[PDB]
Design a protein around this ligand. Structure first.
Ligand code: HEM
Ligand code: HEM
Ligand SMILES: [Cl-]
Ligand SMILES: [Cl-]
Ligand code: NA
Ligand code: NA
Lengths: 713, 713
């Protein structure tokens, strides 16, 4: 069946904006997962999980009689797809059960782990999501084996279809670097937004970089990929040594024995894959990665034996039964247990990437400190495991249940509690009137509130106007935010705020976070008024102001908009067309095609463009909220041509006279070009659409203002 | 960006079931187009369209000063994608403005026609859809040029994204037959469901079959493709000769001059394509098909000149300025006007496919009758033009506005008016009790009402339970409908109906159409009771019984379900796997993936399978409405393997014992295989879901029972 994607493989793809519709969701329109989970008996689930760890199923027998290691791995892979660049991946939507992740080679045999959990999923039904369950099971595994976790939060709602994520351009699973779709260039520079060394891997190659077993050079890939998952050196050592305190790898026989991954398997396989022809195909004969390493003398118990071994022996290169490179301690006694035969013991073994922890000079200092002080190791791994498994969950307001840790961590971008009465509707009207009387313009008001709110991304639920981080480093200095104009606006708003708070009785006060958003509302209302329309923009107070000390400047860097088509802004020259970056930003902001369309056409005529550019400002009444963008864009009396100086800027000229009327960018003109976007623009550019345009603009404006307001959920 | 489609190009694609969500739709959830159109001033629209006909724009100057010909073509292409096999295509959704149809070669320069209509669309806004407007414009073109149309109905709501339609497998535009993805096999057999000879054509190649200028062999393609668009010989001759009474073709220079189609054109083209480097690129120099033919001496006026020319001259083969085959009149004078130069005239010309109307023996008899009796030609073309442009609109109850023809036509599958009081809630309870007391089983009741209602298809809105056509030829004889069992159920129902109607006072009576559906409802109620649930199934009366004379048996044949996964039925072996045909049927029935899932799992346990097959009957309490299908399908204690005798049938055996528990087909097992469908199955197979299952089943049941109920819309 030949498709549009085949005929026009470079057209913009809008279907990413309409995933996760009510059509695909089996739960009713009013189903609220938070409410279901809040009544779950979490202790009873955990008791069932605890029992499961030692209840072996014959179709996938438990190593050492304990599934703990398999489930830690499952839970680390669920969380380990996360990329700080865009917030995509991570455990927060249970995407390991869908394509492509369910069939990545690094997820081999995790289908078995998920199937072992079906009886418990089934028992508790909608009260616990798959997404939550994968992580909870990892925690219970750790607890059952003697490790004290840092806590657990529920609240990850299930999704019902694959997310659209750019995982790379390679067309071959696990393809070595330097091919025609190489994710590397320069001196081993991995392209953004990617966070793994090869297609279908979580982070790095366990044999070493493109299979070269050099622990020193493997360390470089480890450090780079972990950093791209937001983990520093201490957290990376803790997590890798922590995880490899448990279980074993599986490489009993040659990998040519292993059949089709789950999405390619026969229907009879009932969602499982990697069926193996090697001996029994499972248990003692299991093949997963092709490596055959067991790290500790007690694989089903927390210990400090990973570092005891790593430092206590000298290591020699050897090959597994699939020919993969790995390491053995030859001077050692056979002290490591066999997973199925009580009369067999084995020498200690390590992966190339484990030895990275000892032979990279920076990691060795951390590993030594953890070796000498296993209490510090345990605390670091607990904190890192929590961060790993929660990093994409959003503000603490989304955390559910009785085990949420009370310690507030800097990586959570914390927001102080509000301990005072909020402004009411009358107070909000008085504040809007003072904002408008200060002389701040519609353009300034709208640009500032847009700049504060539009940092939100739905992928990990970071960003948004809550916190007033726009006044702090680094957001106050981001080029897109127009640092000098921003500073002038914030100074006037802060004087309004000081006066208003100073006049109050009884504890009432307004945060700068709320006032920045409310001021933006007043600019939209004024713009509507300038066009002859009386509207009220909704506004919900309750944001609080975060301090500079509560704001990790380096972690904020990924939220900088380097492309924001809603402000006609491109920080530099990119390989990806500007219109594709626009749909990418729309997806992160959780907007549908119609909402992206209304919003951008309004922002254009309100003066939200960076630098006061005229590109796309197709109106003679700037700062009035009208549908002028669409009416003028779609006017066939105007002819458009790329400029001689810049092919990404277009001149719109009267077709008869040649007079220059407008200029625009690819972001502006795609609304007149793309067949679906133009059909949208036509709705808003029709003679009967002034009221609809205004109402829909206000609704999406309000939606953007509230994206991070999980305190009102 | 490598996608799931790339890695697993044969996995089942469910996104076709979630197209047309509220996310992609710019209108609000409550927007009702029928109500908007009912308030449009249609007379005012028509006046503006009349004015447009002769308001020539310099960017696409009107031939002969009159756009009429261009617009008739536009309207005929809008309607001309329709295939009777599946009901897909046609004018009813305005799909000509989206990919791929906006860029098919046969739609070249229809982008210009649609852009000429933007000022009018804009003026009237949401009150007239693009889909209605394309057809109305056709009609007005005809009227402006002196032809009285048979009428017009509004009510085609606009859609907002491309429909998923199989248009063929060729990867080259216009590919000639016998390639690696050939749509032809055998003795020129066109594959179902296709209705055109080459990818990107409406019906046939105007030069002749695969470009061979043989009018007799072209006739064969014309007859086959037109039949596959529901037109017989009389209607086909009328439409081709009627249409070619107007306008001209465009082939002024070589086609190498013509650039990118709209979906491939640069952004500055603003949604237009086929920009030509030949001379002015437009008007006198236009290139569209590459042929250069003008049929009549008055191309802007209705006349009888097409058949005068066809028969009045002998024809000689020649070549257009692009090298295409076409025909010129032997020894004729230059009598045909030039489209732009009043001092030029041309000899009469014809397409190969025009000459088919004279050289095919069956067409020649019709064409001669129309030549001798122009009033018969005029009436047949008016009727056929109405059929062409309304064939996919569905029942007459959907037709809006003041120009709807009062004559009821066979092709509309008409349903008699209801002229009598309907049964009320008391009467429905009494009828259900009589149904249940007759001894009809749950299986019989549910299977019969399924068979009656599930013929509906949303593509052209044909089919459904209204009319009671299940009791008529050919539906009563369809293998899927189990003719002998069906007859015995209809006999018992008809006795119940006769007794009930016989006892009424006033004119109250129930239709057999209503009673079939009501009886199905009673079976669902009884099934719920068998499972210990108290359930009332909604029922809406008002269906009427159609007669055999109101039921075209040959046109009904396309509605026969040859694959119906909801009854585990496959009439033969097909190229397409059975799970693909299931999702196809789900689409035609307007079901989302969750509705398809719930519905099939219920039907299985209610005994709706054809032939009482056990395949997928995963319950020990058949005829009880439970979620057993899901709970048993997902039981990992059961292992599935294909049978020796049939690889499309599977045995489910206890994994420990080897005992045979179940058998299933690919339709059954795909719910335990495909990662998205299995996620749905898991919701319904959870311990907390029996109530949700029952409720969701009754909702989708009722949906299916009401699919054709446009009288309640
Ligand atoms: C440089 C980073 C890492 C590399 C290259 C890596 C590599 C691997 C490989 C190749 C396996 C064997 C898979 C099999 O054949 O069955 C495995 C097992 C495992 N890994 Fe990792 N690992 C990494 C980090 C982590 C982290 C961060 C955790 C958790 C905190 C983790 C926990 C585990 C566990 C528990 C197992 C054992 C599986 C079982 O017992 O079935 N690893 N690792
Ligand atoms: C065998 C079926 C048919 C064939 C192969 C066919 C072919 C064509 C072609 C090749 C053109 C020239 C396009 C161009 O270069 O601009 C055209 C024009 C047109 N056809 Fe057809 N046609 C068919 C049936 C129809 C029908 C059913 C109608 C309407 C009832 C229709 C009405 C028109 C009209 C009005 C034009 C003229 C457009 C103008 O003046 O710009 N034809 N046809
Ligand atoms: Cl994601
Ligand atoms: Cl369609
Ligand atoms: Na994410
Ligand atoms: Na259709």
């Amino acid at each position: 069946g030949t498709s549009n994607r085949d005929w026009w493989p470079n057209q913009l793809d809008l279907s990413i904006l309409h995933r996760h519709s009510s059509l695909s969701d089996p739960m009713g329109k009013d189903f609220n997962y938070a409410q279901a989970f809040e009544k779950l008996d979490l202790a009873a689930v955990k008791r069932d999980l605890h029992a499961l760890m030692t209840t072996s199923q014959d179709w996938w027998p438990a190593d050492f009689g304990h599934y703990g290691g398999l489930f830690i791995r499952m839970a680390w892979h669920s969380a380990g797809t996360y990329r700080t660049a865009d917030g995509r991946g991570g455990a927060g939507e249970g995407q390991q059960r869908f394509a492509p992740l369910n069939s990545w080679p690094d997820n081999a045999n995790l289908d078995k782990a998920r199937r072992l959990l079906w009886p418990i999923k089934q028992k508790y039904g909608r009260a616990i999501s798959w997404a939550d369950l994968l992580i909870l099971t990892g925690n219970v595994a750790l607890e059952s084996m003697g490790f004290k976790t840092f806590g657990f939060a529920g609240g990850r709602a299930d999704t019902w279809e694959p997310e659209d994520v750019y995982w790379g351009s390679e067309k071959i699973w696990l393809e070595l670097s330097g091919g025609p779709n190489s994710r590397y260039s320069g001196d081993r520079q991995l392209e953004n937004p990617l966070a793994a060394v090869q297609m279908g891997l979580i982070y790095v190659n366990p044999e070493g970089p493109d299979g070269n077993p050099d622990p020193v050079a493997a360390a470089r890939d480890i450090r780079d990929t972990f950093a791209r998952m937001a983990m520093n050196d201490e957290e990376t050592v803790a997590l890798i040594a922590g995880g490899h305190t448990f279980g074993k790898t599986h490489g009993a026989g040659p990998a040519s024995n292993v059949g089709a991954e789950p999405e390619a398997a026969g229907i009879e396989a009932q969602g499982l894959g990697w069926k193996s022809a090697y001996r029994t195909g499972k248990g003692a004969d299991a093949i997963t990665s092709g490596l055959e390493v067991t790290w500790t003398t007690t694989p089903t118990q927390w210990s400090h034996n990973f570092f005891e071994n790593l430092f206590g022996y000298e290591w020699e290169l050897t090959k597994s039964p699939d020919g993969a490179h790995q390491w053995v301690a030859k001077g050692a006694d056979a002290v490591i247990p066999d997973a199925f035969d009580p009369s067999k013991k084995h020498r200690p073994t390590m992966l190339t990437t484990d030895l990275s922890l000892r032979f990279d000079p920076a990691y060795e200092k951390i590993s030594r400190r953890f070796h000498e002080n296993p209490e510090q190791f345990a605390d670091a791994f607990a904190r890192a495991w929590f961060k790993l498994t929660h990093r994409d969950m959003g503000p603490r307001a989304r955390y559910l249940g009785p085990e949420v840790p009370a310690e507030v961590l800097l990586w959570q971008d914390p927001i102080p509690a509000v301990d005072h009465p909020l402004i009411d509707a009358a107070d909000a009207a008085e504040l809007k009137a003072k904002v408008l009387a200060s002389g701040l313009t519609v353009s300034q008001l709208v640009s500032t509130a847009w700049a504060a709110a539009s940092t939100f991304r739905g992928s990990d639920k970071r960003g948004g106007a809550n916190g007033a981080r726009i006044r702090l480093a680094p957001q106050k200095d981001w080029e897109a935010n127009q640092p000098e104009q921003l500073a002038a606006v914030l100074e006037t708003l802060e004087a309004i705020r000081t006066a208003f708070n100073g006049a109050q009785r009884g504890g009432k006060q307004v945060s700068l976070a709320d006032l920045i958003v409310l001021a933006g509302c007043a600019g939209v209302e004024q713009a509507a008024k300038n066009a002859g329309h009386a509207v009220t923009v909704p506004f919900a107070p309750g944001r609080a102001d975060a301090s500079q000390e509560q704001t990790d400047v380096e972690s904020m860097a990924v939220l900088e908009p380097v492309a924001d088509g809603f402000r006609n802004y491109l920080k530099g020259k990119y390989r990806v067309p500007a219109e594709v970056l626009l749909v990418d930003k729309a997806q992160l902001l959780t907007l549908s095609a119609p909402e992206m369309t209304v919003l951008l056409g309004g922002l254009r005529v309100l003066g939200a463009n960076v630098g006061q550019s005229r590109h796309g400002v197709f109106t003679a009444r700037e700062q009035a909220l009208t549908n002028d963008f669409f009416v003028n864009l779609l006017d066939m009396g105007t002819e458009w041509k790329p400029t001689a100086a810049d092919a990404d800027v277009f001149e719109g000229r009267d077709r008869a006279t040649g007079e220059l009327k407008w200029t625009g960018t690819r972001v502006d003109l795609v609304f007149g070009s793309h067949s679906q976007l133009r059909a949208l623009a036509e709705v808003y550019g029709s003679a009967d659409a002034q009221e609809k345009f205004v109402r829909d603009f206000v609704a999406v404006w309000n939606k953007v203002m509230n994206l991070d307001r999980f305190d009102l959920a």
